[PDB]
Amino acid sequence: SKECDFTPMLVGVPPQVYNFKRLVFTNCNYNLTKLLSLFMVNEFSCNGISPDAIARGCYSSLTVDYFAYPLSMRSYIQPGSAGDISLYNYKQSFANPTCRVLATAPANLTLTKPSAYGYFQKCSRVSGEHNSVETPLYINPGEYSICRSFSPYGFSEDGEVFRRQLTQYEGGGILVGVGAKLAMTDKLEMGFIISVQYGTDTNSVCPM
Amino acid sequence: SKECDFTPMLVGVPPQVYNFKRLVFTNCNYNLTKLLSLFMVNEFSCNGISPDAIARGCYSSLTVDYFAYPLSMRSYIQPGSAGDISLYNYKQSFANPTCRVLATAPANLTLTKPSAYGYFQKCSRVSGEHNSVETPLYINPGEYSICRSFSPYGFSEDGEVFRRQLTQYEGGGILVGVGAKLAMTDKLEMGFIISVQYGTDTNSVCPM
Amino acid sequence: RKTYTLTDYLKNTYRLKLYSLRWISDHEYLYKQENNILVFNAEYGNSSVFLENSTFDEFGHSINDYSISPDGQFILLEYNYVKQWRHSYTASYDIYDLNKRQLITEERIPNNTQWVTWSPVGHKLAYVWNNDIYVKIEPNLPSYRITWTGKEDIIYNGITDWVYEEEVFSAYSALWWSPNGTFLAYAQFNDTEVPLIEYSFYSDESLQYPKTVRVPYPKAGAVNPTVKFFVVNTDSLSSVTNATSIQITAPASMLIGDHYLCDVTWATQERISLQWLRRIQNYSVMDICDYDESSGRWNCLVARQHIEMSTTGWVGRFRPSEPHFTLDGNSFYKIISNEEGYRHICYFQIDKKDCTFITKGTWEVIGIEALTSDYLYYISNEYKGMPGGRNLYKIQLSDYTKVTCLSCELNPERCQYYSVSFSKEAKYYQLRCSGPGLPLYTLHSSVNDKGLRVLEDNSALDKMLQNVQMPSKKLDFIILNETKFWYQMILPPHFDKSKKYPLLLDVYAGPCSQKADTVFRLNWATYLASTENIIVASFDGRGSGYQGDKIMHAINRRLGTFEVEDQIEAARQFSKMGFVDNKRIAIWGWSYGGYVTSMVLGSGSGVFKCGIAVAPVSRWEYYDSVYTERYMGLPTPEDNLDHYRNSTVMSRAENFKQVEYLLIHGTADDNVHFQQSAQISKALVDVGVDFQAMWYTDEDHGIASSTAHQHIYTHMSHFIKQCFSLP
Amino acid sequence: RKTYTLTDYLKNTYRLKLYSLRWISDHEYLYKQENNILVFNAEYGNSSVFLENSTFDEFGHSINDYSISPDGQFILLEYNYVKQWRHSYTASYDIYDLNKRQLITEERIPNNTQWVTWSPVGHKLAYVWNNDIYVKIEPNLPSYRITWTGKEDIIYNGITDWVYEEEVFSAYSALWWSPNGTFLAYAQFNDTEVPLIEYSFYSDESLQYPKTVRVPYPKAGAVNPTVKFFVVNTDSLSSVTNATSIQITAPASMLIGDHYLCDVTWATQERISLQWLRRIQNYSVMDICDYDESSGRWNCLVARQHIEMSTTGWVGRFRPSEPHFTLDGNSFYKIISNEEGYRHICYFQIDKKDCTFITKGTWEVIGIEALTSDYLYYISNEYKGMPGGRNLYKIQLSDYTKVTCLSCELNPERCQYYSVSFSKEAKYYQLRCSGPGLPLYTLHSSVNDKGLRVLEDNSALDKMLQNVQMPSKKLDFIILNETKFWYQMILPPHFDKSKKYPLLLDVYAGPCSQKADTVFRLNWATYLASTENIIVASFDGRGSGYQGDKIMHAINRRLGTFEVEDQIEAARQFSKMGFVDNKRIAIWGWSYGGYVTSMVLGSGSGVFKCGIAVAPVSRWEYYDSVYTERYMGLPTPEDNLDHYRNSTVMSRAENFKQVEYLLIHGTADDNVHFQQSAQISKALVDVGVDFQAMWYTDEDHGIASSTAHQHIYTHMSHFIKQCFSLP
Ligand SMILES: *[C@@H]1O[C@H](CO)[C@@H](O[C@@H]2O[C@H](CO)[C@@H](O[C@@H]3O[C@H](CO[C@H]4O[C@H](CO[C@H]5O[C@H](CO)[C@@H](O)[C@H](O)[C@@H]5O)[C@@H](O)[C@H](O)[C@@H]4O)[C@@H](O)[C@H](O[C@H]4O[C@H](CO)[C@@H](O)[C@H](O)[C@@H]4O[C@H]4O[C@H](CO)[C@@H](O)[C@H](O)[C@@H]4O[C@H]4O[C@H](CO)[C@@H](O)[C@H](O)[C@@H]4O)[C@@H]3O)[C@H](O)[C@H]2NC(C)=O)[C@H](O)[C@H]1NC(C)=O
Ligand SMILES: *[C@@H]1O[C@H](CO)[C@@H](O[C@@H]2O[C@H](CO)[C@@H](O[C@@H]3O[C@H](CO[C@H]4O[C@H](CO)[C@@H](O)[C@H](O)[C@@H]4O)[C@@H](O)[C@H](O[C@H]4O[C@H](CO)[C@@H](O)[C@H](O)[C@@H]4O)[C@@H]3O)[C@H](O)[C@H]2NC(C)=O)[C@H](O)[C@H]1NC(C)=O
Ligand SMILES: *[C@@H]1O[C@H](CO)[C@@H](O)[C@H](O)[C@H]1NC(C)=O
């Protein structure tokens, strides 16, 4: 049977947190212990499943969000945190059982480190008679910020200010975004959000 | 018996023509065919000995002057030439039988190429009531220019002008020198002047 | 009896006396006297000595200034003063311990320091050096470097660039301490793409090749500098790892384009108010930011933003006014232009849109001076319906209809222009009356507004001035189109209204200017009247402030149109009064007055025989962005370029063939560059207009060197006396 | 009858006529007339038409100039002229074929070309572009690039830097063709370490931020530029590999320190003469170099060097004179200062040290004009013992005692100042008489010195001038310490020596100047005399040339000492003559005259009421090295710094309290920088001296713009009329 292909997470420059990538694994078999052992995990926090058991269960569909995330900012990603990072970059969805993995990648891993860490520290929409009305734009859990289009791959410097007008499909107005740039680290620090589901053909995704 | 050590000619940066180096070989045995075959000779011009026979004779003392010399300026070193190079840099002595060797050095030879070729295009001494008297200083055959002290290893640029006062041992006055800088070439081009002598223990320096 | 000669003015032979004091508590203040600082008891008046200047006979350097810490334990000594611009300068600094009575020599403040300031309470120091901010908790301890990004002429941490210093903040510093000294808020400026003005500086005889000075200076429409705002916690500074500055961004209604930071006002120990202004300066926003103790950052709620925009012109007189918060910081008082067009006090709430005007009328509140829980103290030009005066009122916060004037009728003959200085709880207040009579400084107690004692009454000058023929000041108004336009007249002594005097029009006419007030002045006009029998007159026409927005905003996007005509009409009104010789009417001005003086002389009105313009603006595209754009917009075909073109002095060069003109400018003028006058002289020569010029070597905008200030006013006096056939 | 008004001078209503001609052979010349070039037969006078200007009605650009090739096959057309400095400029160039009557469009000369020149015979071209030299054998063929090292403001191949252009060569080019056009000799200049002068340039109204101009300019004592000399064979130019330039070094008696290249004179087709000058300009050497056909290089023999040094001052009048070689080039004639102190012709041999003076007397040979095998033609100031005149003599080479004046008594009343232009074999010569009468151009034939015909006699002006009251020119001398010091006086019409006129001293006093000559001039002095009844006078004191070295070298290392006193004494001599009102004596000067005018006014002599100085030198350390050091040495404590200090105008600022002073200077002066006048105004203000100033925007040293030239002389006229109470 097909083995769940975890390659895209392990090659090249991993995406920034606000512009993350996801992999729906449907109808394949997985070895998750192998996946996590390639890195060195500093956090493995699971909500709605014991972390032991997620490597063992059979799921209708397993999803994984991956992105580059410094262990420096661990507290801003904990469930129910109040940072710009859960307002404007990434918010964990708890409708399905989920697992949060914060890991450092070794030198002898095939991932390339991006220039620096970045995240949006402001994302709000300007409308009104004289562009007087500011309307902050917070993300729904597990969805993408509209600001990620401004600069998908990172920020040249700290405090980058962006703006553009929103098409009438986007609902008019002027979108404004500000980007914080955090300096990079010694070894690449990465974040993984693993979601699972049960239901139609619960056996579609089973371990090895 | 001791073998005539031709190593100093073959290592490092060879001297400039005006600041050449010489090797008196007394009481050793030599293989000259080996020496010349390390290079690729473009001129082998002997005056007072057939070039064939100089590799075979037995000499009281063999001397060799070596220096870096472009084949571009071959005509200025021919016997009785009128260039600045025989006035101010080097002049072949014919009192003893001698051989002139102009050769290109291969890439796989242990010599390092100096930055460029250089030679003095003016060397004259200034004296008089108001430094009015100029007295050009031409070299006697096989001797060194007094200007070589100004810049022994080469010239940073073309037309370098030098001056200094001459100590009362040197006979007063102000020495003035001008240096021509010729651009260097693809492979190192070198010059050898081999002089021999006969007399006291004519067998001191014999072939192999 | 003698007359007030030019030598009297230029050599300061009739000096005024002041009374300057720092309130160090709510019932004490410091006053220096014979170099020995004295600490007065505000209530009783018994004053012991704080510090005697002979302490520093040992110092070895000439001390420009001193600054005693709020806790009184240390004194900051300033020396090696080197002026940069209007406000900026560099100097070296020594901290002297007052308790140990010793100079501190560990971890000394560096040389060439750009700004120093104590914490508002205690003895912390914040100083700027190489465009970087350093915090010094104890004067004998190492500094904590806050910013690492300072760069000459590029990045300014904690200090202003040229245009923010001059046209926005009117100060060098971009430092704002928290009220109890916990937080240090600061601005960062970035002139990376701002064009440089370049002018020759010749120093002295010795310097063989002149310096070329290069100053980042955005002229009209150019690239403006960009500004960021930060807050740092000065209590949590660690010496092992670098300190964090939390950025505060501007509201998104400002990030959509170029903007300015125009006000920073702390409300509480954990709340700060910022005001931002669009580059088109008819829309401003106040952001109110609370410090989040659980994330360490600052939350500025959108529901707490406050939009102050104008539909007839620019926001504020020169900038949006500052807010005066209550103690709890949940409400604030602020001067706003009301629905009628007059500036009055409004009472906002931090989270509610509307405000309540607590004053109203056909007058303007000049400024909010003090605010207690029971009373709000303000200064306005309401008394006798005179915009030229100033008086101190207090309003009862429990009943806005009960208002009390505290300075109106103290001495209404001599005293009509008042400024005030309150104690730290507003328990006592010092009134300063600048005119029309000799200045008078007095103390009062706020609980009863009781007049305690006279501080300085200038009677020393009063006895001196008896032996000299002083001129008198007529202040009145004329009505044009049923609007009162005010004017003043320095009338020579023994003025005879049946005689026809020559007149000299002293003009500024800048937006929101006021050259017709009640203030007492000894200046060049006093010489011209007392000694040379010349009527000096000033006029406040369209564009002049303090008279309502209908008058002040009348020149919006039309600089050099109405205020130029109105000064010509003022001359006509004066000439038809009768006591003015219309053959001899002149005009003179300095910065906007120089611009207007030249425009008037190029107007071809035939009214003025001669005029003299120092350091004048000639084309508004040559002046800085913040000021010019406030009134003119951008010089683009889409915005206002057509009037930018049709407002130049050079355009009028033909019409100087009728007048006698004198053009004066300093060769090292950082503000109204010598370029401006260079272009006028070019234009006059191309059209074949003869005129007189005078360049002042290495001089700045307001010529301040002693020898040059004497020389200019001497030269100008000869020009006026030649123009009037005066002896 | 009317008077010669200022408008007559400024609008050129009484124009002089010239007769300019290029001798294209030994018996033909070119003359342009109504834009149509005419070729005259020198002997007979019958003149057919060379080229009609309507040929270029098709061209489409305004043509500044034309230059027909020596062979007459091509014409070089100049347009897009852009002046750089006194001599330098850039322009675009088109070559028009005269035979095919077509414009050449293959391989066109680039734009912004700095110098172009034909070969002396034929149609080769040498042009400089981006400081690099290009040779163009055929006008329709590709250029051969000679030099690859040209760099803006750093390396100059074939053209001069600022100071070589202005103070050494008096020309932009550093190109010297071989006599038959085989060799192209050129100089290379290297300003790598020369300091830059920087001044503001404001262009026009549109330019928002001014340009800052930066020009490599060595002031007194600074780093001088360094010079190299090369020769290239233009016949052996190959298009496959780059061309060789053979360097010619200076003699070692020059390489021991800083030096200058001051003369390049080809002797034969294979021999060239170079003259080098020590930076201390009292020692020069001529190097004579023959081309070695067997090595391709150039041999300059030491036995052929020629040392020309001076013991009382600097070598030459402004530079060592040029040699006039014989045909074979083995001997040459050259003007030398003889043992008596007078400049006369010496006859050197290329390989023999001594020379033979062929002229001698108490007069100077001004220049060698032509040299045939039988006669040498020279110009001297010998006639009537007048240094102020010029006359053409020829000397017989077979007998140096036989000398003939060819211009003395042609018309000795009207004509006393002559210049000449010979044909290519000196078979005919055109005399030009510049004064005292109206200019007169005539043709002559050398074999008999026969007067052939009158070319231009200015009788058109003569009839015009009948209806106007012209002033007269008195030229005389006075004796001080038994030395004749000459002077001139523009006397108003109907001059009455029993009346006492105001006087205005027109002063230059520069080393080797001569302001007292016989030349005819219509200028500002003519206005001042004819219309304003003012005697304008000039004087030639110590330092003035053409009167011997005892007079000219009298100011050596002491600029601003004797010539300043001597101009004051001249005023005293004139005032005690009687017809001069000593209440009204003024003084005016421009470059060294401006320096002397200021020095005289700061002298405290009490002699001059008022003075006006345009673009004046104020301190000699501000002026360029080559000129200042020629007369002053170096400003080091070892050489002359003490007098460099004690010769400044700023030192005398106190003594302007007695005089009325007007200071005028251009803001874009590349030569006497505005710095100089800026320092004077500074000094006057610090000492509290009132004066009048006038800056001229974007103007150079000799103010040449039409509007500014009119404006200045109008302003100056008002100053003099005010100073004399004139109507
Ligand atoms: C237009 O005019 C300009 C101004 O007049 C001209 O510009 C000048 O050009 C000359 C050369 O023509 C330069 O001199 C050379 O400078 C070299 C480095 O200079 C750089 O640094 C300058 C700072 O000034 C100080 O700093 C350097 C430190 O590196 C110091 O050495 C130097 O002396 C000076 O005090 C900076 O301002 C410059 O811009 C440069 O970037 C310097 O190394 C040269 O010394 C050389 O050459 C001389 C004579 O040739 C010898 O006596 C020295 O010993 C030394 O020789 C070594 O290096 C040479 C290569 O350059 C080789 O030829 C030699 O073989 C030798 O190498 C061996 O020798 C070593 C011992 O010396 C051994 O230990 C090694 O093992 C090596 O084997 C020389 O001083 C001027 O600096 C330059 N000035 C300016 C302002 O630019 C310009 O040329 C003119 N242009 C035209 C087109 O006309
Ligand atoms: C402008 O002025 C220059 C000189 O400044 C003239 O240039 C010289 O012109 C002469 C012609 O009169 C040239 O001399 C002749 O050269 C012939 C040989 O030419 C080549 O020779 C060798 C090749 O083997 C090359 O190395 C060399 O460079 C030449 O390319 C000779 O045959 C001639 O000599 C004959 O006459 C003499 C007596 O006069 C006899 O003794 C000889 O044996 C022989 O019979 C002759 O010498 C000379 O080479 C040119 N030199 C240079 C540097 O240019 C220009 O001609 C002149 N141009 C104009 C338009 O006026
Ligand atoms: C030098 O190197 C060449 C190859 O590049 C080789 O053929 C030759 O034999 C070598 N000679 C010596 C002396 O190393």
Residue numbers in the entry:
A (entry chain B), B (entry chain B): 388 to 595
C (entry chain A), D (entry chain A): 40 to 766
Text taken from the publication that reported this structure:
A novel pangolin-origin MERS-like coronavirus (CoV), MjHKU4r-CoV-1, was recently identified. MjHKU4r-CoV-1 uses the dipeptidyl peptidase 4 (DPP4 or CD26) receptor for virus entry and has a broad host tropism. The receptor recognition of coronaviruses is mediated by the spike (S) protein on the viral envelope, which modulates host and tissue tropism, pathogenicity, and zoonotic transmission. Recently reported MjHKU4r-CoV-1 also uses its RBD to interact with CD26 for virus entry.
Structural analysis revealed that residues Y463, K509, H517, N518, E521, S543, D545, E547, and R550 of the MjHKU4r-CoV-1 RBD form an extensive H-bond network with residues K267, T288, A289, A291, L294, R317, R336, and Q344 of hCD26. Notably, the N-glycans of N229 on hCD26 were observed to form more extensive hydrophilic interactions with the MjHKU4r-CoV-1 RBD than that observed in the HKU4-CoV RBD/hCD26 and MERS-CoV RBD/hCD26 complex structures. Furthermore, there is a hydrophobic pocket formed by residues V513, V548, V565, I561, and V563 of the MjHKU4r-CoV-1 RBD, and a helix on hCD26 formed by A289, P290, A291, S292, M293, L294, I295, and G296 inserts into this groove. Residues A291, L294, and I295 of hCD26 form extensive hydrophobic interactions with the hydrophobic pocket. Notably, the interface formed by residues S502, F537, S538, Y540, G541, F542 and F549 of the MjHKU4r-CoV-1 RBD interacts with the N-glycans of N229 in hCD26, which is not observed in the HKU4-CoV RBD/hCD26 and MERS-CoV RBD/hCD26 complexes due to the shorter N-glycans resulting from different protein expression systems. In this work, a mammalian expression system was used for hCD26 expression. However, the structural alignment shows that the MjHKU4r-CoV-1 RBD is closer to hCD26 and its N229 N-glycans than the HKU4-CoV and MERS-CoV RBDs, suggesting that the MjHKU4r-CoV-1 RBD forms stronger interactions to bind more tightly to hCD26 than the other two RBDs. The binding affinity between the MjHKU4r-CoV-1 RBD and hCD26 harboring T288A or Q344A mutations was ~0.35 μM or 0.28 µM, respectively, similar to that between the wild-type MjHKU4r-CoV-1 RBD and hCD26. The above results indicate that the side chains of residues K267, R317 and R336 are crucial for hCD26 binding to the MjHKU4r-CoV-1 RBD. Thus, the lack of binding affinity of cat CD26 for the MjHKU4r-CoV-1 RBD is the comprehensive impact caused by differential AAs, mainly contributed by residues A292, T295, K336, and E344 at the RBD-CD26 interface. The above results implicate that residue sites 291, 292, 294, 295, 336, and 344 of CD26 are crucial for determining their capacity to bind the MjHKU4r-CoV-1 RBD.
